[PDB]
Amino acid sequence: TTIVALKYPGGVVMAGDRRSTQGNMISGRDVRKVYITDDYTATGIAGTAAVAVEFARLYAVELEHYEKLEGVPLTFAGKINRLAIMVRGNLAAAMQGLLALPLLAGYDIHASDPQSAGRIVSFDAAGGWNIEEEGYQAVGSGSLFAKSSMKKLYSQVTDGDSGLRVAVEALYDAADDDSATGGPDLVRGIFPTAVIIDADGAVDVPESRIAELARAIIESRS
Amino acid sequence: TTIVALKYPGGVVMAGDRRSTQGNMISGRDVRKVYITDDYTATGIAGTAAVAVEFARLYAVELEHYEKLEGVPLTFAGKINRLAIMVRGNLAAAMQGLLALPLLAGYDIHASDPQSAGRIVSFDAAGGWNIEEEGYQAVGSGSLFAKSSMKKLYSQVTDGDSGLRVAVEALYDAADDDSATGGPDLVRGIFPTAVIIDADGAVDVPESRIAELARAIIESRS
Amino acid sequence: TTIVALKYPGGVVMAGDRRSTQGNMISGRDVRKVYITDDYTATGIAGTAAVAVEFARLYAVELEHYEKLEGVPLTFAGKINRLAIMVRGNLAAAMQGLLALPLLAGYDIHASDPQSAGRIVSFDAAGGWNIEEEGYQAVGSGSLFAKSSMKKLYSQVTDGDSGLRVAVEALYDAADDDSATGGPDLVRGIFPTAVIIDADGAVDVPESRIAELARAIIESRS
Amino acid sequence: SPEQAMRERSELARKGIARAKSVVALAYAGGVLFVAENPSRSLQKISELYDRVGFAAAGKFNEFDNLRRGGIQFADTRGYAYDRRDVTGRQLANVYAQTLGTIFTEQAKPYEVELCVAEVAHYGETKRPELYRITYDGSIADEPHFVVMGGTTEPIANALKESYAENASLTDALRIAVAALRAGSLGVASLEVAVLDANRPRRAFRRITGSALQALLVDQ
Amino acid sequence: SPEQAMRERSELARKGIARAKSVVALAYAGGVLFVAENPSRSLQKISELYDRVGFAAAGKFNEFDNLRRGGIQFADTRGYAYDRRDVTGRQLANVYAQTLGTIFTEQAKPYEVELCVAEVAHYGETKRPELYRITYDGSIADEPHFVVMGGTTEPIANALKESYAENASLTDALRIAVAALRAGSLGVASLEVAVLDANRPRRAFRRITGSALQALLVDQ
Amino acid sequence: SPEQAMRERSELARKGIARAKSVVALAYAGGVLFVAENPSRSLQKISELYDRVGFAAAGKFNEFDNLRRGGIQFADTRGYAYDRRDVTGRQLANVYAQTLGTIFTEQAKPYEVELCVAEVAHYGETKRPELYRITYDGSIADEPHFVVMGGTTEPIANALKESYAENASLTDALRIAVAALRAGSLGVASLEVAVLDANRPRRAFRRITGSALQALLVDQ
Amino acid sequence: SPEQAMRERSELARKGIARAKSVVALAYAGGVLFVAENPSRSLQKISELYDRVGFAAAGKFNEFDNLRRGGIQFADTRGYAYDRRDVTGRQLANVYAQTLGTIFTEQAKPYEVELCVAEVAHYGETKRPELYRITYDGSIADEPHFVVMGGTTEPIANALKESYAENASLTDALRIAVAALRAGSLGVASLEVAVLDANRPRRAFRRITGSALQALLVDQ
Amino acid sequence: SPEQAMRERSELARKGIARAKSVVALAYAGGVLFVAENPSRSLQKISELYDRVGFAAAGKFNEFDNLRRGGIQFADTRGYAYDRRDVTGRQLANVYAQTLGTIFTEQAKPYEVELCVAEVAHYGETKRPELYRITYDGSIADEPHFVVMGGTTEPIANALKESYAENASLTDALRIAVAALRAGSLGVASLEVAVLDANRPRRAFRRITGSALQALLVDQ
Ligand SMILES: *[B]([O])([O])[C]([C][C]([C])[C])[N]C(=O)[C]([C]C1=C2[C]=[C][C]=[C]C2=[C][C]=[C]1)[N]C(=O)N1[C][C]O[C][C]1
Numbered sequence A, B, C: 001t002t003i004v005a006l007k008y009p010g011g012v013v014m015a016g017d018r019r020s021t022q023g024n025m026i027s028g029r030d031v032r033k034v035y036i037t038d039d040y041t042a043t044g045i046a047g048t049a050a051v052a053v054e055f056a057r058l059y060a061v062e063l064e065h066y067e068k069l070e071g072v073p074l075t076f077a078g079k080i081n082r083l084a085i086m087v088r089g090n091l092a093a094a095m096q097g098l099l100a101l102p103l104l105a106g107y108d109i110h111a112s113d114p115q116s117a118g119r120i121v122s123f124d125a126a127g128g129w130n131i132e133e134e135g136y137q138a139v140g141s142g143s144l145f146a147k148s149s150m151k152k153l154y155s156q157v158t159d160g161d162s163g164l165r166v167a168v169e170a171l172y173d174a175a176d177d178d179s180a181t182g183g184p185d186l187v188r189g190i191f192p193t194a195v196i197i198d199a200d201g202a203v204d205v206p207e208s209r210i211a212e213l214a215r216a217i218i219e220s221r222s
Numbered sequence D, E, F, G, H: 001s002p003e004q005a006m007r008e009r010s011e012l013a014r015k016g017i018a019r020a021k022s023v024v025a026l027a028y029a030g031g032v033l034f035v036a037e038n039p040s041r042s043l044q045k046i047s048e049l050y051d052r053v054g055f056a057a058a059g060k061f062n063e064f065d066n067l068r069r070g071g072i073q074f075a076d077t078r079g080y081a082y083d084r085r086d087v088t089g090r091q092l093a094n095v096y097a098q099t100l101g102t103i104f105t106e107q108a109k110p111y112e113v114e115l116c117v118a119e120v121a122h123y124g125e126t127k128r129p130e131l132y133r134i135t136y137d138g139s140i141a142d143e144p145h146f147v148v149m150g151g152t153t154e155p156i157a158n159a160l161k162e163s164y165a166e167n168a169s170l171t172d173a174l175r176i177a178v179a180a181l182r183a184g185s186l187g188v189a190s191l192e193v194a195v196l197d198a199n200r201p202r203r204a205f206r207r208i209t210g211s212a213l214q215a216l217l218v219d220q
């Protein structure tokens, strides 16, 4: 697995592969690892499938539940804290096998400079968290390779579409080294999924733009 | 064990063997491993027999219970979630020996395209689930062999009766390699059971059509 | 890690690095390890990040909470006791991995001699505490190197600005020997954080004066 | 006097509802319209519950806001236990009838509230918007066109028995509403308005703010 | 005055039943027929319980719908503990008599309901369909032909004392029913109808919808 | 007499509030001003709750001091559970309305208190300072300009209905206040004064002590 | 009659206080003086609480001795939890007002007591000694000079309103006290006397025994 | 009528005390003497508590015997928690006053008892023997010379007001006692006698049997 998050001038992009493995045996080829938690938050999740899906599903409910009750969405700080608590609330389980680590990406509609309202928060098996402020972050079996490729390719980030290609390229680089990550399947037509967040909200990046972007990378490296 | 599920134009078919083993010692030759959970849901169950039977029995009660209470059947999404919870609620037992993994097949009477209303949902020991969308899936000691045969024979699936033969053939292929699966017993007249679901509902496939189909496979391979 | 605290005639200074490591793998370069707990208290925290962050966060709330309820800040003795309790309350977790040791620095606005109102209280994994009265103290993987350097350079301590340089220098000396402490990053422009407390209150030392002081040490040692 | 006792409870509650302000909900082309007179900027009488279901109440605020929270709590949990699509607001009406029923018996003083739960078909789907009214005593009924509650209802409800345009417009039903409201009494852009917009993809709720509201509001 | 106390309880309850709408169940060739006047589209007074047993009640909705759920809860559990075939509806009549009995004593205000539990023989089997009536005070009786409850029963029950065709048809019994119902008063395809179809393989319950209903309904 | 019972509770409480001293809060340029007559040096009627939200109450001390503590308790936990920025004082007003609501029903004797929760925009931000009044019976309202409580309010509140300078100064609003307070009756630097200073970085609370107060106080 | 009920409680308590003996505390040069008429040798009405805080009460012994113990309990734990320096007796006054407050509501019969909590500055420190009076109903006030309680207070309190020497001596304030006490009525070295000696290093409490007392006592 | 209610309780209890037999305790040279008229051979009104403290009570047996046991229970635990030497019977008097206090409020019917706790100096030590009287309402007082309880006290207590020999003999004080007891009325070696023998090493209790008693008893 590799989930990756980028900060660009407008906002943020998060994208993750769709491999699901069990041993060294491919058991999934179309997993949706990146979720739109609310209007301005995307959350990606790595590790134990059953927990990952449940984290996302549950988290989303929590956020929208606060909103319906208090009448206002949580602060971004609030949103972070809740996710962190949830992660710590799993440390017991994690210790036994049921490990699952989230990556948070969001646009803070209350940041001073609306061109730096993009946020990337990484999470700690124990419920710790660091607001990244370095533009890029990854989680998962291949996050090491992504981060390192994404290190070099980061200067090229100019805008949404610009960042998105670097994202997909890192995930391509991850799959190239981490047999548990899984690159683009042309033979089957399956491609990494992504989400973009700017002042207007969070939107699922259509696979068209991704599939295209992917073939670009494949050709140029080919 | 092998339980197998196929998606065809009209709907879905699920079929599973009837072997029950204990060590390398045949202790069952006529086990009913596939169940009609409700009008549009069949559930097949692998692993620990005491638990498999109880899952099926209990699950059906739960679905019917919701219906009688709220006056309307659960969403397919709902049905999926409940089975998942149940499976999770067994993780403790699973850990000790009492492991049991279900395969869900159903027809969603609410799908946009009524020719794609066939569903196959596979389940994970920790309560995870993946809606298959690849047309076929298997569970059990021989699922590996079934899936792989059924990979090749999938193009042949045209309609109900067409799919059903591929099902039966995969189960034949499973028992061919997995000594814990058990093929068709001509000497005794025992054959894999099956269930079909289309817009009309879920119906037990009569053994006649199965026994027939089985002999066809036997002779052609003979 | 290394957090360091110094006592000078006016009051106290505390400063700590920003490295966060995981194995022998840098995973943080700008962690804020020193916190202003209230108007006269700064608290620095070493070890497990998730706990350290949470100690600080929680502790500050407790202090402020007493104040709002009783109408008056706790005695300094009171403040020490509470922090101590909190640390003991973590012994269980510490035993398993989640270990976190704080260093307290404050100005007691009720000290007889307002030139000796600076306090340094070090803490013990079991909830023990010793008011240092020796002018300097350190906690963390590099605290040994710091304390030792800071032994020599202590005569130099004349005033706020004077002490602050010794602090920064000991943190430089720590990173020189403890690979887990991390010195000043000129290439990235990241420097140790600090806090100063005198009769006027506790204030964040601006990075300017630190960055400056840092390059002074770098050049002189160079 | 068990029987006479229940009469006093009913009385107490029914008076409280009278002296409270008025709230109205009605079915229109786009879904369901919520309109209530509310001078307060923050203390709202109309709220979202779940995806396609909505809440509005008249009476003692602290009491109905409590029930409101409970509803949101029930729906959100129910949704997570099964699926989002399994929450009905017919359900919530039950829950409310159950709760208010208990309260009218167990609690010392009965709740001085009257509730309205409204549902409007999921996105693609088309279904006749539904309205439920739950009274203080736990009684529950479903009007097919409009629901009135709080203060003197007769003049407000009567005005609607005629002015109700079966398939009105958002701006037309709002006009019909605020007018029918004035009948039991003004009615300026200083009140509370929200809709269940059946055309919305997921969360079928929307508050109508100040400036946007005027562009729809009725001349008195 | 413990004795006089119980009389006020009975009174309060019995009035509530009167002011509520009317519900009728009766035995016919195919099994058991459930017909009740209900304007609402969702708030149903007639429901399934188990395989071959059915529920219908008149009175305060939130109260009987509660008992309804309890029944379903009891039946489903009992079935899983032993076998599906071991649930009787005579059992459910007991359980309801027990519950309503306690309620009439323990609860501050007694339930304003009247219940009907109906069973009809398993598929192949042939057995005389059974009808149970449970009153608010926990009393229980079993009519052999038909059961009336809610509102003024005399005119409705009287009409049946003659109109009841022992072995009627589905369309005949429904005609007899809706007619007998009008006697205590209209009666349009805007009410609630369902049957216990003894001919069904497993779940002997079936609601009769709108269009299909008309093809059976009585001219007034 | 459930209905008549509630009226005695109201009466008892309302009297207690009257015989108690007077407290006033109002909106001014710098944020919110808290002024109350209090001869005591330590038993304070006005307190901080959270960052930008403040508490003031008139009535039986031990009772409101209790609620005060509860508020501080709620706010601090809430803040820790989520973020500091997620505490609203609109929230606290609800909690108080909820608590006082329950008390007025469940507790033998109702609380003899009247509360004021006030919020004023975070540092950089600019927003209209908010004032909430919670009564003994759990009722809650939000005045936009000023709130009066304790003793005879009419003369005190009336004086403000005119003397209220929309965007007054700290020394001007204090002048306006202490004057309006004397209208319902002295008023020496022997009372209790504090402000919600919107200009403060984090903790928007400040008590105005003895000497510093004089430099703003009104001549009588 | 909730309102009338509370008046009976007040009455019962108030009378008990009256029929009880008299207790006086006042501020003097050295700190605070405790004087109460008590023929008993062991059953004391004046006690230490914490380092610089002291207890004195009139009324039904078993009742106030209970509160006394509770105080000591509270203070000791509070001190241990935080620091000795963090206990205030303003705190204890609250706790007592809270306790007596609950009692006057929850307990069948209200406590027939009246309390006095007194604090006097830490050793080196100089601060104006503080006196708190807590009544049976949980009301709490802080006199700046002297506190009277038990029996008829008017003539005892009146005598003090004049004889109170602001900065009296130990032997002078004792004189002033025992004299003022006799006004409401003898007064021999057969009573109870103790002081909060502000000059003591840590525990600012001291009982004045028999022989040492005489050397200060007033001629009648 | 909370006030009037407590008067009935007092009445009920005080009458029960009256119709019960009489018990007397008094201080003498050797320590403390316990004398009570008791025809019963086994049902004793006088008992040991701890080393140097003793119990005696008049009234409804099952009630005081209960308190007796409780005392022994308290004393023994306290002793084991700290030291034997830390038990005071002043302590036991408190506990008894506390218990009977609660009972007089919480229990439906108050205890019809009156208690006497007596302590007499440890072996070597010499200290004025102490006597405590605890009444049914939880009131507690300490007579310095003698205590009377049960039946008509005036004639029995009055006889003592004179016959009391300050430092009497065991045989003298017994003489004085039995005589003083007959004044409220015979008095043969068929009653109950025990002493707190200050001269004993550890357990300062001793029952005076039949034959040994005669050699001390008074001629009537
Ligand atoms: B990946 O690790 O993010 C990815 C996760 C996703 C499904 C949310 N999936 C995995 O690769 C898991 C595999 C897995 C699994 C596979 C098949 C059936 C059930 C099942 C249940 C949980 C997880 N494997 C994996 O590599 N990780 C590595 C470290 O974390 C735990 C397992």
Ligand SMILES: *[B]([O])([O])[C]([C][C]([C])[C])[N]C(=O)[C]([C]C1=C2[C]=[C][C]=[C]C2=[C][C]=[C]1)[N]C(=O)N1[C][C]O[C][C]1
Pocket (backbone or CB within 6 Å): B001, B002, B019, B020, B021, B022, B027, B031, B033, B045, B046, B047, B048, B049, B050, B052, B053, B099, B140, B141, B180
């Ligand atoms: B099959 O593997 O799913 C099949 C299952 C079905 C009968 C529910 N049955 C098995 O082969 C079990 C055997 C088994 C058993 C055998 C004999 C007596 C009692 C008994 C009770 C429970 C299960 N064996 C098996 O292969 N699996 C392999 C992995 O899962 C657990 C056991």
Ligand SMILES: *[B]([O])([O])[C]([C][C]([C])[C])[N]C(=O)[C]([C]C1=C2[C]=[C][C]=[C]C2=[C][C]=[C]1)[N]C(=O)N1[C][C]O[C][C]1
Pocket (backbone or CB within 6 Å): A124, A125, A126, A128, C001, C002, C019, C020, C021, C022, C027, C031, C033, C045, C046, C047, C048, C049, C050, C052, C053, C099, C140, C141, C180
């Ligand atoms: B330091 O030791 O004070 C420092 C502390 C700070 C983060 C508050 N932190 C560390 O160096 C930790 C690293 C760490 C960590 C790294 C990456 C992801 C999550 C994470 C969570 C907790 C801590 N490492 C470390 O050296 N210590 C030394 C002994 O105590 C525990 C680990």
